[PDB]
């Protein structure tokens, strides 16, 4: 169980690839977790009939 404290402000991107994380749960002491300007802009391009680049 990963608990984000009330002081945490999201400023980075979490990228998981090929990780079988069935068990992990992410919970916050707050109802809403705000997302501010990410330090490093990592974008993933989706190769689909319409091509659209996303920063998740």
């Amino acid at each position: 169980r990963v608990i984000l404290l009330k002081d945490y402000m999201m400023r980075e991107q979490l990228f998981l690839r090929d990780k079988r994380y069935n068990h992990i749960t992410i919970t916050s002491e707050n109802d809403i977790v705000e997302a501010y300007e990410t330090e490093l802009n990592r974008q993933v391009e989706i190769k689909t009939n319409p091509i659209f680049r996303v920063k998740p």
């Binding site: 009330k6 002081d7 402000m9 707050n30």
Partner: protein, 55 residues
Amino acid sequence: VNGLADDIQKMKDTYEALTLSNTDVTYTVGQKGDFDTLNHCFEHIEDLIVQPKSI
């Protein structure tokens, strides 16, 4: 002896208040929050010796 212990605890609190400058805070107002009403929360903030980086 309890008075001496309370003085030492007040010293802990003063040091933490001084070092609070380079951290950030998050006060929750509500029934179950840190402060009962918004008026209390900004009465506490106005009393801070050193203003933190971002409340």
